[PDB]
Structures are given as structure tokens and as C-alpha cells.
Design an enzyme around this catalytic site. Structure first.
Site, PDB file in Angstrom:
ATOM      1  CD1 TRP B 280      40.663 171.312  64.529  1.00 28.74           C
ATOM      2  CD2 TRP B 280      40.784 170.559  65.762  1.00 28.74           C
ATOM      3  NE1 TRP B 280      40.908 172.631  65.258  1.00 28.74           N
ATOM      4  CE2 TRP B 280      40.949 171.626  66.330  1.00 28.74           C
ATOM      5  CE3 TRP B 280      41.175 169.873  67.052  1.00 28.74           C
ATOM      6  CZ2 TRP B 280      42.190 171.590  67.384  1.00 28.74           C
ATOM      7  CZ3 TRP B 280      42.035 169.599  67.802  1.00 28.74           C
ATOM      8  CH2 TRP B 280      42.626 170.783  68.130  1.00 28.74           C
ATOM      9  CD  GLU B 285      41.004 170.055  56.304  1.00 24.53           C
ATOM     10  OE1 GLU B 285      41.993 169.277  55.697  1.00 24.53           O
ATOM     11  OE2 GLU B 285      40.928 170.544  57.748  1.00 24.53           O
TER      12      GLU B 285
HETATM   13  C1  HEM Z   1      44.265 169.741  64.396  1.00 23.38           C
HETATM   14  C2  HEM Z   1      43.757 170.222  63.490  1.00 23.38           C
HETATM   15  C3  HEM Z   1      44.983 170.525  62.203  1.00 23.38           C
HETATM   16  C4  HEM Z   1      44.098 171.604  61.695  1.00 23.38           C
HETATM   17  C5  HEM Z   1      43.409 172.516  61.251  1.00 23.38           C
HETATM   18  C6  HEM Z   1      45.045 170.872  60.381  1.00 23.38           C
HETATM   19  C7  HEM Z   1      44.892 171.120  59.243  1.00 23.38           C
HETATM   20  C8  HEM Z   1      45.557 171.117  57.791  1.00 23.38           C
HETATM   21  C9  HEM Z   1      45.312 171.266  56.507  1.00 23.38           C
HETATM   22  C10 HEM Z   1      43.908 171.849  55.236  1.00 23.38           C
HETATM   23  C11 HEM Z   1      46.182 170.537  55.436  1.00 23.38           C
HETATM   24  C12 HEM Z   1      45.648 170.889  53.691  1.00 23.38           C
HETATM   25  C13 HEM Z   1      44.767 169.713  54.069  1.00 23.38           C
HETATM   26  C14 HEM Z   1      44.161 169.688  51.861  1.00 23.38           C
HETATM   27  O1  HEM Z   1      43.392 170.250  52.019  1.00 23.38           O
HETATM   28  O2  HEM Z   1      44.097 167.887  51.297  1.00 23.38           O
HETATM   29  C15 HEM Z   1      46.651 169.897  56.604  1.00 23.38           C
HETATM   30  C16 HEM Z   1      47.544 169.034  56.294  1.00 23.38           C
HETATM   31  C17 HEM Z   1      48.122 168.296  56.694  1.00 23.38           C
HETATM   32  N1  HEM Z   1      47.965 168.177  58.193  1.00 23.38           N
HETATM   33 FE1  HEM Z   1      47.615 169.226  59.423  1.00 23.38          FE
HETATM   34  N2  HEM Z   1      45.536 170.220  60.982  1.00 23.38           N
HETATM   35  C18 HEM Z   1      45.481 169.925  61.412  1.00 23.38           C
HETATM   36  C19 HEM Z   1      46.222 168.691  62.988  1.00 23.38           C
HETATM   37  C20 HEM Z   1      46.771 167.438  61.965  1.00 23.38           C
HETATM   38  C21 HEM Z   1      47.525 166.490  63.070  1.00 23.38           C
HETATM   39  C22 HEM Z   1      46.939 165.944  63.900  1.00 23.38           C
HETATM   40  C23 HEM Z   1      48.387 166.094  61.967  1.00 23.38           C
HETATM   41  C24 HEM Z   1      49.728 164.640  62.597  1.00 23.38           C
HETATM   42  C25 HEM Z   1      49.864 163.866  63.093  1.00 23.38           C
HETATM   43  C26 HEM Z   1      48.693 166.683  60.926  1.00 23.38           C
HETATM   44  C27 HEM Z   1      49.950 167.301  59.742  1.00 23.38           C
HETATM   45  C28 HEM Z   1      49.536 167.259  58.391  1.00 23.38           C
HETATM   46  C29 HEM Z   1      50.214 166.338  56.863  1.00 23.38           C
HETATM   47  C30 HEM Z   1      51.801 166.003  57.652  1.00 23.38           C
HETATM   48  C31 HEM Z   1      49.706 167.543  56.104  1.00 23.38           C
HETATM   49  C32 HEM Z   1      50.440 166.946  54.509  1.00 23.38           C
HETATM   50  C33 HEM Z   1      48.997 166.449  54.224  1.00 23.38           C
HETATM   51  C34 HEM Z   1      49.455 166.526  52.557  1.00 23.38           C
HETATM   52  O3  HEM Z   1      50.417 166.500  52.421  1.00 23.38           O
HETATM   53  O4  HEM Z   1      48.719 165.462  51.856  1.00 23.38           O
HETATM   54  N3  HEM Z   1      47.801 168.237  60.310  1.00 23.38           N
HETATM   55  N4  HEM Z   1      46.225 170.022  57.224  1.00 23.38           N
HETATM   56  C1  LIG Z   2      47.350 161.594  50.834  1.00 25.24           C
HETATM   57  N1  LIG Z   2      47.346 162.190  51.381  1.00 25.24           N
HETATM   58  C2  LIG Z   2      45.925 162.370  52.256  1.00 25.24           C
HETATM   59  C3  LIG Z   2      44.193 162.675  51.399  1.00 25.24           C
HETATM   60  N2  LIG Z   2      43.536 162.736  51.671  1.00 25.24           N
HETATM   61  C4  LIG Z   2      42.797 161.542  51.869  1.00 25.24           C
HETATM   62  C5  LIG Z   2      43.009 163.580  52.229  1.00 25.24           C
HETATM   63  C6  LIG Z   2      42.800 163.969  53.805  1.00 25.24           C
HETATM   64  C7  LIG Z   2      43.022 165.207  54.320  1.00 25.24           C
HETATM   65  C8  LIG Z   2      42.497 165.586  55.435  1.00 25.24           C
HETATM   66  C9  LIG Z   2      43.709 166.504  56.366  1.00 25.24           C
HETATM   67  C10 LIG Z   2      43.414 167.289  57.242  1.00 25.24           C
HETATM   68  C11 LIG Z   2      44.406 166.282  58.056  1.00 25.24           C
HETATM   69  C12 LIG Z   2      44.078 166.325  59.540  1.00 25.24           C
HETATM   70  C13 LIG Z   2      44.959 165.344  60.678  1.00 25.24           C
HETATM   71  C14 LIG Z   2      43.583 167.797  60.349  1.00 25.24           C
HETATM   72  C15 LIG Z   2      43.037 167.983  58.970  1.00 25.24           C
HETATM   73  N3  LIG Z   2      41.673 169.526  59.077  1.00 25.24           N
HETATM   74  N4  LIG Z   2      42.993 167.323  57.444  1.00 25.24           N
HETATM   75  C16 LIG Z   2      41.630 166.269  53.027  1.00 25.24           C
HETATM   76  C17 LIG Z   2      41.867 166.167  51.771  1.00 25.24           C
HETATM   77  C18 LIG Z   2      40.747 166.753  51.146  1.00 25.24           C
HETATM   78  F1  LIG Z   2      42.091 167.488  49.678  1.00 25.24           F
HETATM   79  F2  LIG Z   2      41.220 168.084  51.801  1.00 25.24           F
HETATM   80  F3  LIG Z   2      39.732 166.238  50.512  1.00 25.24           F
HETATM   81  C19 LIG Z   2      42.780 164.588  51.525  1.00 25.24           C
END
Ligand code: HEM
Ligand SMILES: CNCCN(C)c1cc(CCc2cc(C)cc(N)n2)cc(C(F)(F)F)c1
Ligand code: HEM
Ligand SMILES: CNCCN(C)c1cc(CCc2cc(C)cc(N)n2)cc(C(F)(F)F)c1
Ligand SMILES: C[C@H](O)[C@H](O)[C@H]1CNc2nc(N)[nH]c(=O)c2N1
Ligand SMILES: C[C@H](O)[C@H](O)[C@H]1CNc2nc(N)[nH]c(=O)c2N1
Ligand SMILES: [Zn+2]
Lengths: 407, 411
Positions: B280, B285
Site C-alpha cells: 500500500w 509517493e
Molecule cells: C506494505 C507497504 C509498503 C510500503 C509502505 C512500501 C514502501 C516503499 C517505498 C516508499 C519505496 C520507494 C519507492 C519509490 O520511491 O520509488 C519502496 C521500495 C521497494 N519496496 Fe516496499 N513498500 C511496501 C511493501 C512492499 C512489498 C510487499 C514488497 C515486496 C514483496 C516491497 C519491496 C520493495 C522493493 C524491492 C523496493 C525497491 C524498489 C526499487 O528499487 O525501485 N515493498 N517501498
Molecule cells: C523500476 N521499479 C519500479 C519503478 N516504478 C514503476 C515505481 C514503483 C513505485 C511503487 C513502489 C512501491 C511498491 C510497493 C510494493 C509498495 C509501495 N508503497 N510502493 C513507485 C514509483 C515512484 F517513483 F514512486 F513513482 C515508481
């Protein structure tokens, strides 16, 4: 081994060749990044001198000249004979400007070449040091039109004759521990403030008392001095909208002057080298005023705005944070004291980075420190990949003198 | 070797031993830190040690290390590899693996929730239609009428690299972007390239500011196929502000379910190139990045005008002021519609506790400060003040290149 950096907002890509001249170590390895960690001999000496003189003589388009070779020769003979050496005024100035140029955590480096260098190497006493520092303060402050400056005291010899300024900044507010259990003034300076008293200062136990200087000359015991109040420019903090803001009783000083770092040039060490520029607003309004272990005023300000401090999700902290930073900027501008907001400063740094990549082949930069502590992603530096590495001449951290000083 | 991290607000010091188990490289050296860099066909040769390390971890976690069950599994996998050149994970290993990849994701602030992940095994899937069906179910399950549930759907692992399953969308739900002849962009500028592909593949674009993209699904290395997610499955939230009544008239909405679908899940040396996962949103974001990045919807100006801020000098902090109200609005709208969301204060505070707990029970918690610290109000959250150590553990989520740059077209 030629590295590229991308800006994810403009798609501009720069190529870094400068990092290959890097000498010192980062604290990072192939297996672990320590990017967020705050603090990670005649034989040693000569190649350091040489590395420096080489870049000095290259900078003045006289690399491999007789004058170059003559200086290498002369410095070499002086080291072999004296175990150290003295920098020519020209080299001293080049070194200081380049130490600033090399400070990867400094967002204000677009100003690097316009640094007023005060040669204080003839200083012998704490009184002498005090005089040099009052002159620095007055010059840099310049009735509110601030000018960048550094004052450089004699270089280390055997480590027993060190010059040190015990204060972390030339100008800071005291901090005392109340029977209340709370803290009065600036909590970050409690330990230093006690040492002032343990040495004889009579604190007026106020909230905003300008600390006295504790100066150490030639390895001797440090002495107390009070900066002439007329030299300490201060700004009463008011808000352009909220009339009540002034009753909060806040004020700050105009001159940020770091005095606890170590300047290294050509392997020579300047343990006392206070330097100053001018504030970026967030340093005061976000860190000084709103940090939980500093003046921590968010709550009181929030109440005065009558915000809903019931749930974090009303973002009441964020709202107050903005207004507080509005007020700082407004107050400095109103009193005509140089200040820069985080948008202008980071935009400046992007140009500087561009210039450096173009004219020098790179710009070492610490993203963690460069991105402002508020509104990060709406400033262009957030979307800018940066490479962090260490170049000399450099400003280094050094241990607090009390944990070292042999009284 | 031991490693110390300090929180500079509390002076709490923690000791990392877990980094010792680190395998992969960081991109950094003793001479350069690449901490702010965004992005810095396997043989039997390398495969068994990777398998063995994973199975050693798994069996340790279930307190069966060195058991006959442990030893028999190692031998089974050994045989299967040297005979078939790969191996299959048990259901239990897949679940464990997926939870731990999330647990190891050093850029994720939401990891306190890592043990509650619903794992959908889609390894029996063979076609893009099958992929669509699985993804529809993932969305319905995860959305749960607004009471969001973390989930991941796992499609068949890579074999020879020529039969990859891939989801071509970066997220399962995302808005179209259309570059106009005048240079302006309609909708989400981040999705222009992908939107174009979709259109080229036969998508009839409505061409509005918030068009939900179709799914583009590749099964078994075949050319990808287009599918429209049933709109009734796509939960959206109209954005309004609790005090500003003109805010609704900006015409903003957003989808409720963030579901990353372009990453690669690695488990015991096996590569799952299609593994969409969802949780969620944290408020920023949407309110900070999606709405306010100059390269996204970029609404700071329009919002600032309607607020009548002094927009002539940046030192009025008009940008900062508008940003807050926008983020207030996103949080308000989601809460009002009873759709799960978390503010950045709450999320980072929970992460600190998660982190401390991880040091005690696990010996560490790898974390990327650069990504963990929220994109507004950095230092008024506790993570800003927390030293972190970043290193790479497996199982893990990895980046992979975009499919359109590598795909061999069948026609
Ligand atoms: C349940 C609530 C969750 C919250 C509030 C949350 C929050 C976030 C946020 C804010 C980011 C940075 C995204 C961005 O700025 O682009 C992030 C990155 C990431 N999250 Fe979570 N997340 C959640 C759940 C999950 C779940 C369920 C998974 C995998 C099973 C996951 C795996 C990852 C991974 C691999 C990244 C790095 C993505 C990237 O490098 O672009 N997260 N998360
Ligand atoms: C190259 N990897 C995917 C990049 N993408 C499509 C992506 C994805 C997200 C979602 C990140 C995220 C993922 C999950 C599982 C939960 C959560 N709260 N936020 C945000 C954003 C962004 F930057 F915040 F807009 C971009
Ligand atoms: C003239 C305007 C200047 C501006 C706007 C500026 C801005 C900043 C800021 C915001 C920081 C982060 C420090 C913190 O948050 O505590 C910083 C760090 C630093 N600056 Fe600058 N600065 C200026 C002048 C200078 C000068 C004149 C020098 C040296 C001659 C200098 C050298 C450094 C060094 C060494 C650091 C790192 C300090 C540390 O690591 O604690 N700066 N600067
Ligand atoms: C170890 N020495 C650095 C730590 N100190 C004492 C320091 C220093 C500063 C000022 C940094 C700075 C220095 C200069 C020269 C200009 C400018 N605008 N800002 C701010 C602050 C802070 F964070 F605002 F409190 C602390
Ligand atoms: C732990 C973390 O490294 C620490 O909070 C740093 C973060 N970035 C910073 N950035 C600046 N400019 N100044 C600081 O004091 C800090 N503190
Ligand atoms: C260059 C820099 O690493 C890049 O802008 C990063 C900074 N930190 C981030 N942090 C999060 N959570 N998401 C991001 O996209 C980014 N982008
Ligand atoms: Zn690093």
C-alpha cells in the site's frame, strides 16, 4: 573506470574522470556502502608535498618548468633538513580554496574561488588568536553583506604544539542542564558550555547566550575570550504573516563559522583554520530550530498555529516546518543579512557541478549531505546522481581537543 | 568483524554482524562511493553453491539444520541440477524465499510488514491469458475493497533465457502518458514510452489525463499480449483537500494499489523474471513524487496559483507550502474513502523500530538511506538521523532491463 552520472529529471549525463586522482579512502567496500555514516614522517611527507606542488604548478600552466622543478627541489631539501616545510603564500591560498573546492558535502562550492584567506601563521598566543578571529568575524560579516573567509593558524609540528579553537563554531549559543531535567539553550553545546564554566566563564544562563571563545596556542592550555558583542550580528526572527511569531522569542546569528576542522595541504596539517560563508535557510530553520535534540520548537509553533496535533497524518509538523523556514528567510532578508534559500542554493550547485565536470572532469559530492533536510525531491539535487570520493587539499574532521589535551 | 551504526538523535548504537553474510557487490570501492547511483543463462557451475546456501538458510530458519530432511533435500536438488540443469523449489521454500527478498530489500521503508506477505504460486502458468487471470486475482485479493493486503504472484522461473515470463508494465496499474505534437504531455510523462508500445500493439487509447494502462503480458518467451484489467477491479481515489474546496476541481485522482511488476526475484540461484508484488502507498509517493516531480504531473504551479502564494521569489517557499497541502490532500482523500495509506512520519517511525528489532534478532538490517529518507520533510523523520549500512543479501529483488530492449520478436 570512467564513470557517468545521470540526472533523472533532465536526462543530462556527465562523465567523471576526476575521481581517478583520488587518494584517501571512503569507508565503503565492494561488499558494504557506508554512505550514510557521519564519520567513517619525512617519508610520508615528501610525496604529499610533491603531489600538491604538481597540481599547483599545473594550475598556473608551469608544469615541468624550471620554477616547478626548483620548488620541488627546495621543498625536498627543506623536508630532509627540517622534517617539515613552509608553504609560499601563493600555495597556501591555492590550497585553502581547493580544500573548499574539494569538500564533497558543501552545497555552496560555486563560490569556492572567491575566498578571502587570512594568513595567521605568525600567531604565537591565544590573545593573538583572539585578535585574528575578531578581525575575521568583522571582515566576513561586513555589516550584513557577508564575505567568505578563512583564517589559518600555524601548522602542526609534533602534535604537542597544536593550535586549536575549542569551539565548533566561532559563534554559537550556550546550553545548560536545568534541575527541571530539561535543557536550556542549545542542547548540542551542553558539554562545551560546561567546559567554559569549568575554566572560569560566568554564564548568564540565558537561552541565547553567545558562547565565549576557548583558544589554544602552541599546545598550551586554552584561554577564554568574549567576542565584542558589537561584532556578533544577530537576527530577531519574525514571520511576514503571523504577528504572534515574534513573541516566540527566537533569534539567530548571521555568521556560520566552522572552527573545529583540520585543513590538510601538501601533507601539512592546519589544526586551527576557522572558516565562514553565509547560511542556507534550512540549516537554521529546519535543523537548528526543529531537530528534536536541538531547539525543538515544532510543538510550540504548531500550537500557536492551532493545528490538529492529534494525528501525524494532518502533517501539522510539515506545515509548521514550512512557516518556520519562511520566517527565517524573511527575517534575514528584512535585516539585510546575506542568506540563501534551499532552492536557489541547490540550483546553484547544479551549475557548479556542470562547470566542474566541464572544466575539471568531475565534482566529488555527498548526496546524503547535499540534499536539503526539507522538500528534498522538489530541489534538483535530489534527482542528481553524485559520486563521492576524497581529494586533497581537504578539510578533515579531528577529535574534540578536551579528549586529547594534556593539561 | 563488527560494525557500528549510531542514531544521532537518540545516541542509540547498534552492531551489525549480518553484513558478513553479504554476497553480491555494492558498486562502491575504498576509493569511491556510489551510494546515490540509481542502477549500479546460468550454469550448473555456479548454481549448486547458490542452491545450497539458500537451503542452508531455509533449514536454519525452520530449526532443521543438518537434519536428514535437510540433507536429503540438498541431495535431491544436487541430482535434479546435474540431470536437468536447474531445480524446482518446494512451495515452502518459494514462500520463505519471497518473504526474505522483501525482508532484504534495502530500499524499502515498509519492511516491518515483511512476514505478512500473501504468496501466489503461478508457476503452473503457460500463456499470457493465464497470466492475465492470475494478475486479476492478485489485484482483487490485494485491494480487498480498500483494506489492502500485501501480495506477490510468482510466474515460472527462467530456463535458457529464451522462454522468459515478463510483465511489460512497470506497475500493474498506471496511467497512460501521451506526448503531444506541441511538446506538452497529457497524463503521466513517466509512461510515454510504454503507452506508445501499447498503442502500437493495438491499444485504443482514450487519451485522457488518467487512463489506466492495459496489461502487456509475455508468457514463455512469446510476443507479449494486451489485456484490459476489469475497471471494477481498479480502485481509485478522487483527490480533495479538507479545507480547500477548490482542490477537487483540479481534477486529480490516483489508484489505490501500488504493484511493482518489472523486477526480478532471485531465490537460491533461480530467476523469477515475472513476480509482480504489491503493498500500500506511503503518502509522499503520490503527493510528492507522482504529483510534484517536474517530470511527472507537475502540479505545484497550478496548486500554488489557486492558493495565492507569492510566486515571484522562491524564498517565499511557495513550492514548499503547496507541496504540503497537496500531501495533506492525498492522505485525507485516502482515509476518507477508507483506502489503506500511511503518512511518512508513521512509516519511518515504524521502520526505525523494525530496524532495531532486526539488529537484535538477525544481526542487522541492510538499508539504503538515500531511498529510505522521504522526499519531503527529511530531518523531521527519525530515519534522517539514523546511520544505515547498505549491503546485498539473497534472496533478493533485482532490476532487469526493459523487455522491449531485449525481446526477440517472433512476429
Ligand atoms: C506494505 C507497504 C509498503 C510500503 C509502505 C512500501 C514502501 C516503499 C517505498 C516508499 C519505496 C520507494 C519507492 C519509490 O520511491 O520509488 C519502496 C521500495 C521497494 N519496496 Fe516496499 N513498500 C511496501 C511493501 C512492499 C512489498 C510487499 C514488497 C515486496 C514483496 C516491497 C519491496 C520493495 C522493493 C524491492 C523496493 C525497491 C524498489 C526499487 O528499487 O525501485 N515493498 N517501498
Ligand atoms: C523500476 N521499479 C519500479 C519503478 N516504478 C514503476 C515505481 C514503483 C513505485 C511503487 C513502489 C512501491 C511498491 C510497493 C510494493 C509498495 C509501495 N508503497 N510502493 C513507485 C514509483 C515512484 F517513483 F514512486 F513513482 C515508481
Ligand atoms: C558561502 C556560502 C556557503 C554555503 C551556502 C554553505 C553551505 C553548506 C551546507 C548547507 C553544508 C552542510 C553542513 C551542515 O548541514 O552542517 C556545508 C558543509 C560544509 N562546507 Fe559549506 N557553505 C558555504 C561556505 C563554505 C566555505 C567558505 C567553506 C570553506 C572555506 C565551506 C566548507 C564546508 C565543509 C568542509 C563542509 C562539511 C562540514 C562537515 O562535514 O560538517 N563551506 N556547507
Ligand atoms: C564538525 N563541524 C561541523 C558541525 N557543525 C559545528 C555545524 C556547522 C554548521 C555550518 C556548516 C556551514 C559552514 C559554512 C562555512 C557555511 C554554511 N552555510 N554552513 C551547521 C551546523 C548545524 F547543523 F546547523 F547545526 C553544525
Ligand atoms: C545519519 C545521517 O548521515 C545524518 O543524519 C546526516 C544526514 N545528512 C546530513 N546532511 C547535512 N547537510 N547535515 C547533516 O548534519 C546531516 N546529517
Ligand atoms: C539520484 C538519486 O539516487 C535518485 O533521485 C533517487 C534518490 N532517492 C530516491 N528515493 C526513493 N524512495 N525513490 C526514488 O526514486 C529515489 N530516487
Ligand atoms: Zn558507498
Amino acid at each position: 573506470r570512467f564513470l557517468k552520472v545521470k540526472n533523472w529529471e533532465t536526462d543530462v549525463v556527465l562523465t567523471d574522470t576526476l575521481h581517478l586522482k583520488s587518494t584517501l579512502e571512503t569507508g565503503c567496500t565492494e561488499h558494504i556502502c557506508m554512505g550514510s555514516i557521519m564519520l567513517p614522517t619525512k617519508d610520508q611527507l615528501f610525496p604529499l608535498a610533491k603531489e600538491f606542488l604538481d597540481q599547483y604548478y599545473s594550475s598556473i600552466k608551469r608544469f615541468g618548468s624550471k620554477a616547478h622543478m626548483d620548488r620541488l627541489e627546495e621543498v625536498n631539501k627543506e623536508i630532509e633538513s627540517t622534517s617539515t616545510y613552509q608553504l609560499k603564500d601563493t600555495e597556501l591560498i591555492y590550497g585553502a580554496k581547493h580544500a573548499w573546492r574539494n569538500a564533497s558535502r558543501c552545497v555552496g562550492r560555486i563560490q569556492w574561488s572567491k575566498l578571502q584567506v587570512f594568513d595567521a601563521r605568525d600567531c604565537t598566543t591565544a590573545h593573538g588568536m583572539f585578535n585574528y578571529i575578531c578581525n575575521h568575524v568583522k571582515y566576513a560579516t561586513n555589516k550584513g553583506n557577508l564575505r567568505s573567509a578563512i583564517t589559518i593558524f600555524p601548522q602542526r609540528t609534533d602534535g604537542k604544539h597544536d593550535f586549536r579553537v575549542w569551539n565548533s563554531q566561532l559563534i554559537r549559543y550556550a546550553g545548560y542542564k536545568q534541575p527541571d531535567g530539561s535543557t536550556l539553550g542549545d542542547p548540542a553545546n551542553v558539554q562545551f558550555t560546561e567546559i567554559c564554566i569549568q575554566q572560569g566563564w560566568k554564564a548568564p544562563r540565558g537561552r541565547f547566550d553567545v558562547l565565549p571563545l576557548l583558544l589554544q596556542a602552541n599546545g598550551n592550555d586554552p584561554e577564554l575570550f568574549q567576542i565584542p558583542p558589537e561584532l556578533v550580528l544577530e537576527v530577531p526572527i519574525r514571520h511576514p504573516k503571523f504577528d504572534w511569531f515574534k513573541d516566540l522569542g527566537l533569534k539567530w546569528y548571521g555568521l556560520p563559522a566552522v572552527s573545529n576542522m583540520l585543513l590538510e595541504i601538501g601533507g601539512l596539517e592546519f589544526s586551527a583554520c576557522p572558516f565562514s560563508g553565509w547560511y542556507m535557510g534550512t540549516e537554521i530553520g529546519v535543523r537548528d530550530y526543529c531537530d528534536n535534540s536541538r531547539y525543538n520548537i515544532l510543538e510550540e509553533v504548531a500550537k500557536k498555529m492551532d493545528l490538529d496535533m492529534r494525528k501525524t497524518s494532518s502533517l501539522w509538523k510539515d506545515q509548521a516546518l514550512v512557516e518556520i523556514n519562511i520566517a527565517v528567510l524573511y527575517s534575514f532578508q528584512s535585516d539585510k543579512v546575506t542568506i540563501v534559500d534551499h532552492h536557489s542554493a541547490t540550483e546553484s550547485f547544479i551549475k557548479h557541478m556542470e562547470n566542474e565536470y566541464r572544466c575539471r572532469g568531475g565534482c566529488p559530492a555527498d548526496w546524503v549531505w547535499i540534499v536539503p533536510p526539507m522538500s528534498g525531491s522538489i530541489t534538483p539535487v535530489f534527482h542528481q546522481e553524485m559520486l563521492n570520493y576524497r581529494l586533497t587539499p581537504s578539510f578533515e574532521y579531528q577529535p574534540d581537543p578536551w579528549n586529547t589535551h594534556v593539561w
